[PDB]
Every structure is written in C-alpha cells, then in structure tokens.
Design a protein around this ligand. Structure first.
Ligand SMILES: [Cl-]
Ligand SMILES: [Cl-]
Ligand SMILES: [Cl-]
Ligand SMILES: [Cl-]
Ligand SMILES: [Cl-]
Ligand SMILES: [Cl-]
Ligand SMILES: [Cl-]
Lengths: 207, 213
C-alpha cells in the first residue's frame, strides 16, 4: 500500500505570511494527489486535485505542485480561517491512502482568559456528585496553566481540562477545567479557587 | 450536493454495522460513491467505493468483512461491515470519489456496554460572583454512553458566544460542558436554556438556567 508522509506535523503561521506543506509518497503516484482542509468539527473540504488543479470556489491563495513522489501545498497570504488539519490523499493505486495530516495553527497576540467559576448545582449534589467547573474563555496561546486550590492548598487530583479548537475569527482558544469531587469531600471544605497563569476566581460553599 | 448518513451509533461486538447514505444533488449512476472512516487518533482510511455501474473496490485491511451495495431507484448506497470489533469504532463518512462532496461524519461505537442517557446540570453564576457587562452561563452534561451528545442553546437560536468542550471519558462514561456568554442586562430577563440531545438513548433534555437560591 502507498504510504504518504506529510511534514511538518504542526506549523504556526501569522496571517499574511506563506506556508508550504510537504507530502511524499513511498512510490510514484503520477499527479493523482488530492489535498483537503479539515477543521476538528466539520467534514474535509477538497482544495486541490491532480496535485495542482484548483477546485471551483477555492480561494486562489491555495496552490499545489508536484508529480511522481514529492508534492507541496502552498497557502500564500494565510487568513485566520485557514487553521485546521491539512491531509493529502493518493488516488493512483488501490487502496487510496491518506497522509497523517499537518495541523496549522494561526499565530496572534497573547490574550488573557476570561475566567468563570461555577459551584456544583443543587441537582448534582443530590446524586452524590460535586463537579466544580471553571471556564477560561478567549485566550492565547493554547498552553495555559490552570491551578485549583481548596481551602488554600494546591489540588491536582480529579482535575480534567478540555480545549476548543481555534476560533476562526480571533484565533483564540477556550478551555474547561473541571474538579470532580464526591458530595462528601465537597461539603468538608469551604473555599474553591481556579487560577490561570495570575487570573483568579474563587467561591465559598457557605455564602 | 448533500449526504444523509443513517444507521446505529452503537453496535455490539461480532454483529454487523449497517449504514445508509442518501444522496441529493447528484445521481448514484454517475461518479463513484465512497465510504471513509476516521479513527479517534485522526487517521483517515478509505474503506471502498461503488461505481456508477455497481462495480465495487474494498480496502484489503477489511479482509472481506465489507460489502457496499447501491439502489439507483432510491439514490442510496449502503455499507455492511461484518464481525465488528472495538477496532471498528470510528467516524464514518459517505463521500463522492474525489471527496469534493463529503457528508457530516457519523460516530459509530462498537461496545457491549449499555446506552446511558446524560444527566444535565445547569450552571448559573455563584450567588456572590463579580458582575460585568457580560455573564457566562453553563451546562454540565455527565454520565452518558456512547458519544456523541449535541448541545444547543435556546434550541440553536443562541449561537454566538457559545463554547462546547470536547467530551472526556471518566470510569467508562463521558462528560462535557458548554458555556454561553450573553449581555448582563438580558439575563435572567430573556431566558437561556441548554438543550442536550443523545441520539443513542433517543433522549433530549432541556434545562433552563435559573439564578441560584
Ligand atoms: Cl509566520
Ligand atoms: Cl473526592
Ligand atoms: Cl481556595
Ligand atoms: Cl437528487
Ligand atoms: Cl471486540
Ligand atoms: Cl460527545
Ligand atoms: Cl429552548
């Protein structure tokens, strides 16, 4: 089976600058190479067929070249909407095979998160669960540090973080940080804090 | 051109995964019609296609467990994948030959586990939270299986300022949250409701976000 090797695995680019993504085939595939853009949400969009032919309604800043084994996808003057996964596919030899993808991140100015903390809902506390939820919205860059504290003391156990994809307009991320406790543990402590690296939100169970 | 992919989101190990793709804005008897799947790790696999004339090609990784048929009179085609295992858990897509047209994915889970509907908890601000020009509300969706759930706010009429976070697996069940930010002046005066749909348990739950007691 033809193996397609894509590089780089990840790329960051500032809007207005260029990118060139590489796809190399383990054997010749002639010009039978497609390029796709996929956001982590939706379905892939076809950008290029036969290695270098433009698809109806694809902006002209996308172009492809290559024949044989070595191909490139270029995006001249990258836009904030260009973030996401870029995959090549060969249609020369059955079975058709995909590359592993290049993840394109759009670079922008540092932005502090807006932080919101939510105590467990009265409905949850009846089922013996106590999730303390912290939303860190519209920040950059992706790799933010979130500390939990309970009654002053750092807390790592029972913390799970989840990130949205990049925003297509402003290039920010959002993340949830959830501290899952039992009602038993929750009721034995007064104060709960989540802090972004410091931007801090806190509440007291007795208030 | 549009695909409607239909069939189970949950299949038991050793049973048959059967999907249907309904095609509009293109005849099945021109072009080729494909099935593609995406594994949880992001790897895409081309499963097979059926030609305008009924000819089939199958990915040899599937080793003759796969069948693709078509019904030209209905503008539909079918995937039957026999003897499924947890390795068949993936997002399945129907697409034309070159993937110019590429349907919305369908997440299919192969598991012996029972379907569990989600518990939905509204997240109103703490009694004593700092006030601002905007307020963030949330909705915690806990203890469902399998993925996915779809979260909407005011049945989709509130779409701006929404962040729905990817689900995380804890003790064989999924959890996710969704946040919505609205102007402070407008809540609670203009109500905000999360709506959570879980196709696998054929369940939808609406919870109004109410200020805390
Ligand atoms: Cl750059
Ligand atoms: Cl606990
Ligand atoms: Cl604290
Ligand atoms: Cl039609
Ligand atoms: Cl299995
Ligand atoms: Cl989900
Ligand atoms: Cl509603």
């Amino acid at each position: 089976d033809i193996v397609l090797t894509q590089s780089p695995a990840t790329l960051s680019v500032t809007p207005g600058n260029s990118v060139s993504l590489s796809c190399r085939a383990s054997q010749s595939i002639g010009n039978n190479l497609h390029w796709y853009q996929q956001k982590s949400h939706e379905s892939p969009r076809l950008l290029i067929k036969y290695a270098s032919q433009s698809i109806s309604g694809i902006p002209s800043r996308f172009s492809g070249s290559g024949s044989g084994t070595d191909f490139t996808l270029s995006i001249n003057s990258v836009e904030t909407e260009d973030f996401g996964m870029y995959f090549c596919q060969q249609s020369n030899s059955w079975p058709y095979t995909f590359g592993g993808g290049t993840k394109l991140e759009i670079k922008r100015a540092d932005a502090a998160p807006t932080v919101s903390i939510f105590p467990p809902s009265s409905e949850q506390l009846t089922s013996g669960g106590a999730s303390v939820v912290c939303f860190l919205n519209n920040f950059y860059p992706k790799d933010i540090n979130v500390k939990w504290k309970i009654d002053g003391s750092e807390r790592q156990n029972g913390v799970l973080n989840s990130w949205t994809d990049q925003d297509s307009k402003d290039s920010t991320y959002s993340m949830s940080s959830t501290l899952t406790l039992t009602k038993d543990e929750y009721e034995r402590h007064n104060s709960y804090t989540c802090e972004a690296t410091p931007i801090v939100k806190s509440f007291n169970r007795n208030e | 051109v549009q695909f409607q992919e239909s069939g189970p989101s949950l299949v038991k190990p050793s049973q048959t995964l059967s999907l249907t793709c309904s095609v509009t804005g293109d005849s099945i008897t021109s072009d080729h019609w494909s099935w593609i799947r995406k594994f949880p790790g992001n790897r895409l696999e081309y499963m097979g296609y059926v030609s305008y004339s009924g000819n089939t090609f199958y990915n040899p990784s599937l080793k003759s467990r796969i069948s693709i048929t078509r019904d030209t009179s209905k503008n539909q085609y079918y995937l039957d994948l026999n003897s499924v295992t947890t390795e068949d858990t993936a997002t399945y897509y129907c697409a034309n030959w070159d993937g110019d047209y590429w349907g919305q994915g369908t997440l299919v889970t192969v598991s012996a586990a029972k379907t569990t509907p989600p518990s939905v908890y509204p997240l109103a601000p703490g009694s004593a939270a700092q006030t601002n020009s905007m307020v963030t509300l949330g909705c915690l969706v806990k203890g469902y299986f399998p993925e996915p759930v779809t979260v909407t706010w005011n049945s989709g009429s509130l779409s701006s300022g929404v962040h729905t976070f990817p689900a995380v697996l804890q003790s064989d069940l999924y959890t996710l949250s969704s946040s919505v930010t609205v102007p402070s002046s407008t809540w609670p005066s203009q109500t905000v409701t999360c709506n959570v749909a879980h196709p696998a348990s054929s369940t939808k739950v609406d919870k109004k976000i109410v200020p805390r007691d």
